[PDB]
Design a protein around this nucleic acid. Sequence first.
RNA 1: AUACAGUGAAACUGCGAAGGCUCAUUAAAUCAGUUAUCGUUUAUUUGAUAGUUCCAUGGUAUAACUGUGGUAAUUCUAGAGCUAAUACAUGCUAAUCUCGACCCUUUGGAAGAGAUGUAUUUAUUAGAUCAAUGUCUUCGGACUCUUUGAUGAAAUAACUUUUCGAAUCGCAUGGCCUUGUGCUGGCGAUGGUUCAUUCAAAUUUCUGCCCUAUCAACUUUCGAUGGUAGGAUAGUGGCCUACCAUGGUUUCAACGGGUAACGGGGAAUAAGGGUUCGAUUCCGGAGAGGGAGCCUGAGAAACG
Lengths: 229, 37, 37, 744, 166, 123, 134
Amino acid sequence: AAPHHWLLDKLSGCYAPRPSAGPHKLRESLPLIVFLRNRLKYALNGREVKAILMQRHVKVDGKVRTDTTYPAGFMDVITLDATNENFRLVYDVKGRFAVHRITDEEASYKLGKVKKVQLGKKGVPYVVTHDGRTIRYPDPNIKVNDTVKIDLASGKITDFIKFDAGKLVYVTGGRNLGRIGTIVHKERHDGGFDLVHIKDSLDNTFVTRLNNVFVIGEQGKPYISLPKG
Amino acid sequence: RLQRKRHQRALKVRNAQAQREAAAEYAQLLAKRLSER
Amino acid sequence: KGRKLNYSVQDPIANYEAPITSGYKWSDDQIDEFFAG
Amino acid sequence: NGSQSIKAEDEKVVMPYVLRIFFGRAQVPPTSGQKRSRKIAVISVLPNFKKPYINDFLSLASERLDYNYFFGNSHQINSSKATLKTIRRMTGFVNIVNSTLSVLRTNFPLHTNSVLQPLIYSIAMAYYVLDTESTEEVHLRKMASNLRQQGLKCLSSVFEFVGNTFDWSTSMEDIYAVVVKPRISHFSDENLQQPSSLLRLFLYWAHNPSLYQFLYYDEFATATALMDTISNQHVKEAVIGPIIEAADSIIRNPVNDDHYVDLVTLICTSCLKILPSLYVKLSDSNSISTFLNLLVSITEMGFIQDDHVRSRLISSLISILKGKLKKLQENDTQKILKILKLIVFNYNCSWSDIEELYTTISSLFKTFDERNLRVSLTELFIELGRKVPELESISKLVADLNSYSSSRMHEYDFPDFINEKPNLNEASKSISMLKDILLPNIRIGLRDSLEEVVLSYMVKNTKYFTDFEDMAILLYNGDEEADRRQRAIKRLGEHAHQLKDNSISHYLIPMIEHYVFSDDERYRNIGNETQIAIGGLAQHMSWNQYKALLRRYISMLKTKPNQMKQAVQLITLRIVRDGAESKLTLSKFPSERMPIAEALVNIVLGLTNDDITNFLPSILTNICQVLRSKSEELRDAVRVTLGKISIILGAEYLVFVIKELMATLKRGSQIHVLSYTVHYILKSMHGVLKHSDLDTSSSMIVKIIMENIFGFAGEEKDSENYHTKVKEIKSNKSYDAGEILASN
Amino acid sequence: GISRDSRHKRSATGAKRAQFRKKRKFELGRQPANTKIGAKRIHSVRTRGGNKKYRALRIETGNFSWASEGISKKTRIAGVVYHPSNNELVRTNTLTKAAIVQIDATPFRQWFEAHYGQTLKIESSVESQFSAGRLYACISSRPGQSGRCDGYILEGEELAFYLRRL
Amino acid sequence: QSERAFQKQPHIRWYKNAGLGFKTPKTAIEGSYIDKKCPFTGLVSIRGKILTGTVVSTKMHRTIVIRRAYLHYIPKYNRYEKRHKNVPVHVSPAFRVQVGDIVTVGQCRPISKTVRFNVVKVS
Amino acid sequence: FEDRFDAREHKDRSNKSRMQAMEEYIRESSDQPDWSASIGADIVNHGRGGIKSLRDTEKERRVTSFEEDNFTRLNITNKAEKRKQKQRERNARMNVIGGEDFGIFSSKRKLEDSTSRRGAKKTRSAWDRAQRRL
RNA sequence: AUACAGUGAAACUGCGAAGGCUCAUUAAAUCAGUUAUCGUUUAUUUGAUAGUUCCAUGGUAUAACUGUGGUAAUUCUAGAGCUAAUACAUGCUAAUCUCGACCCUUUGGAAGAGAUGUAUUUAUUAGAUCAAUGUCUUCGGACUCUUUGAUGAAAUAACUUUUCGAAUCGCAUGGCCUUGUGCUGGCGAUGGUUCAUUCAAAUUUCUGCCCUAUCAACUUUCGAUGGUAGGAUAGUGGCCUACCAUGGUUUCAACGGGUAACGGGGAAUAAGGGUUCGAUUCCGGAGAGGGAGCCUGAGAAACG
């Protein structure tokens, strides 16, 4: 009854935890019970993960948010107070949620793909992201599928990454879900299979969608740290 | 009752002096972005 | 003129009521000598 | 209750004028004090009593806005209003500086002035109260210090009151009593005037007519003072000319020239300002510019000068004769200005203008030959009128040629100033040649021949109406001139005008070839005409996207040859914009409605890219951007880009064939594209039949040979189950033929 | 009303054997409330959470808009003479959207005499109604959904556009 | 160009642009045609996907019946049986489409029972 | 057409082709030892069951690893145990003789069809087989 | 503890039950994925988000409760008397925002003019230019056609029986001397209008394994096919009605024929040898005695 992304062992139970509503969707997130209890194993059961949630160790996106099924989606920096645990969780190359450990100056921010820019009411420019941070007043040159950098103390955009040909992009969606390498090709079609294409070890080619891909930095310099093997 | 009449009015004028000033305080940042653009 | 004036026979109204034999209390000769003019 | 009282105001008109005046009289009887305040001023006032007075002014505003025609006005309401306004002024200017109740009574006073201006906004030419001077003296003694108070972009309490008092018939009695226009003119002649200065100027311009139609000699002297203000405000309508509301200036200047002639220096200043009205902004319309030039002529008919304004009016006619706008109405006003400018040059100008502008007759061609046989020594307005006739005004073709030749004869008989006049002739002929004209382009070519008075035969054979042997001799003359920035730009402009999208004629390839040959012969002049070659390539690059891209693609490819010769000569420049234009060509490559032109554009970018080390870093990616549209399953576009790639291989050297083959094999890689894209290198190896007996690594091409003849391709071609692939003649017995004179 | 579904009817291919389903809640067709003239009564019906819907049946105070200046002012209703979305609808004299209904134009007289002074540049076949009182005006607002009667006056082009019709 | 009642007019001559690589002809920017559901002036907005094919019939007005044959790699009887599709489409003031005439359409806002596509191109 | 996220094609299967004869040959030619138990420790119910098979001790090692790894005893879940424990022990006493399962020799399942005779490196060209050798 | 003070039958309250059996046989229309909704609803999740004030606190009317009773009798009752609210419903409320004539030079703004919302439903329109590294240098400038960038192709005239501008709490005596609660004065949770997200639903693009031409015509016989307008809608929609046109699908398989459609379709887990046994979601839709009509809710044609 589980998805593939959670890295959930089959010998666990019968009812799978539906995440509650929140920032991200159901299909692109993992809740805190499947995060803490059975992935990096700070708990043994739902009772004691509710106990540490009542103790309020979790500090995801700089706020506490004491809830069992809180849908932590892409790169919400899970922060735990004891042993200064800073966790940025991204996608691995085979579809799961690889939770990388980072440090404090990297967990002081996150980034987010812009979805739409609106002239909503009363002359106010407007920007949303995958956690829905409706932050005030970016520059006019925010296209769709660019990348804002959230402040995580206040909410303001601090840095901006422009989407164009020659940018380091992350793909979350479809049969390319979780690949990095961002350059063999660029092809913007007019309604589907439109993208920037991603290399491999032998620099192979790949096809995805615009909304299923979003930028993380430059060719060699992302200010996100990434795990390795 | 009257102490609540003190605190209600004080929190109301403080809410005004926070919100209605902060709104123009980021509208001026929009003005800086528009001047630089 | 599709649904307009279907000259068909319909099921529940075919015996919805029943007639009467004498009907008018007048005679038909009383009709003729009633509105000859 | 504000919405309820607004409903009561929206339904507070249903009763008659008697009941409306009765309700207004009851509203007046709240805190009038006519026993105490109808003499001079009030007895006492309070904060809450002024709040009843501020509410009374607000109720007066609401009543006037509801009944905004009649309003039920009464002298009791007028006295209550004057008492409230005087009490507001008295309380505001007599209370101490604590500013709370003072700003309350000040926003009571501005709202009461707004309600007072609403009464004249509603019932202006209805009452016209004969006891106006009571309220007039009250408001004057209140607002004496409002001298420059109403000078802003939005200050419209007393400025709107002054405009209302000035825009009436007999309510200007309080204006012409002592002063309205004095304080209005003080704030008008204030130097920090915002765009209400034009409103005040239009109000005084409309209000001078009531002061002129007034029989009173005081108002006659006030109209004289309004004309004196029009003469003393000679900087306001100059500095405030930021919009297209110059019709107010043209309506005052015609009114001033028709009204008052008071000084010869004033008439010279008016003529110089109306000369700046045509030499300040190019967005002046026809009627406004005609009335401005007619007002300059009307000031010149009274009190013009003999040398300075003579030359100023001559420059005005020298601009207006090159204009001649609005179906000879501006030409008739220019002839009147030339006949009023009062000089010997102006006398010859009026003669030679009236002898040609005689209502569509043969006197134009008569007068051209007349002044040719009797050539005048003024020659400035003569060259203007004979260059407007040499432009696209159909008649006087041979007369235009004779006029240009006679101007050249005078410029040679001078032997300095008339050579600078020939510089203006060349700067006019340049914009004439870069145009869509037919007769005037030939007249500009005749002027080029007269300035050239081998080269003269070349010019007369370019203007020979033959165009086949003529264009062949033009190409041979370009070859002789190859074996000049503006001059070659003008020659190439005339050639591009004779071959400017005229696709109902043949030899357009040789015409664009002659254009590119003259561009190359100008680009060889690197010390002078490198900038002109860059500008010509830039204009051709703009034409490569501006709605037509067939011959402009070959123009781009053949203007790349100047870059190729320059890079071969260099063996410092600006690589940045060249690389950005290469990116723009790569974006035009991904267009395919422009596939063949885009393949030639890729060839053009590769011909231009011959830098020091950037031709190593980008040529493989350029070959990738070329072949990515031909490995794209197209029966004709693959062949056209194969022709472009064979031209690219013939252009590039043997050091680039390795990068070309590697990029082609890295772009086309899939099975059943490996059996079709051998035609690429089949064409390319024969395109490079002119390389020496050193070669590339050739492991790539022997890999191509082995995969296309051995194993699966052997099974595929030696089976009998494939429909049709016309690029498979087995195609592979050619690469060793390419390589035997190069590699082994 | 009944329904909103394609299941009861045939598509662009001509299919049969429907016998589909018990109709759901979200195929809700309410009764057609033909709005008339009367005393102002609006039924406040519920849908989709607290989505109150104003179903007007007997509305009078039409806010009709002077066109050339855009002055939406308050008036009464007389009757619709032409509306061939149902040619019996004008026989029964209801009041729906896009109908051409007659108005006693006395507040428009008041506004003209109030912001122009004199009484009567405007077209002659509407100057006749400026004199008489009843002018033609077409309803914009939806009394069956928003519960209101707003509209726009007929001024010249749109006037003759309807007068040549009927 | 007015054969029906009820103020045949644009609904706020009027002109807009959907963008995204589809031209608006000059009569459809400034012309007497109403453009009620033609997407260049229109009331509809563009979205979705864009399909291309030739036509079969254009008999009724505001009905463009496209045909659409396309390749599909059949593995069952290992031969390609040829595709055919149909879609009705509203008119545009740019081309009286006759038989043949490969044209393309964009998905928007169901107009009749079966049309979500309106013509944006002719070539 | 378009892509659709398929965990059944980027999921580690590795069991359609795991044949015990190939795995036994790999254990023979492995040249690294095999982690066998101290010899009495792997018989089960005083000999009432078998010894235990190699797959059963692999599965037991996995269960005890998961067991210690997240501190939870597994259970007596009725449907899964009535399937798997009873069917497993009955085919164990059928086919496992002395710690060795001989069930495979009584089973039709082609070796070379699924688990040998490579499908990706099929080398359907003379040139591709020539380059695969050299 | 003489206006409250702990146990607490029976009453109001917050929520609980938050998803269970049988019966007649639907061929991508039941289903699964997918495209979209600037074509739409949304409780809860999450991020954001309020400026109109004339000559010390507002009203009776009902419970529970007592008391008198009826009836064989109910979570059936009726009179009479009181009594409370975050129940009902009328109503008490400092002055700050820009342009800046003037500046006295830094402690710089005094005068004047223009201000000030939401929720509902109506119309006009804001939504072609200037800056250089260069055309000619006459080492000055009219500069955009060239060489590159930029503002850029909700402001207002009205309705509506209009919602509001905190009768919520916690942590912190803290600062001031207006000579007494005179101003309290710092922050955080709950409010509170609106937007977006999330959740879910409805439509909608396309794709997906029986044999079928002895099913070759169907569709206008629940509008057939489309156009225009209205109604109803959560909105798109012949979804329904007026008018108009005679369309539309099909041999490139329309439309129609049945079951090992108690079986099948990935609907899914796969198992270290069982090769169509071997994990499951769903057979189709209904039904709460029988059809019909109505009501409630973020969600329903309700297992209550």
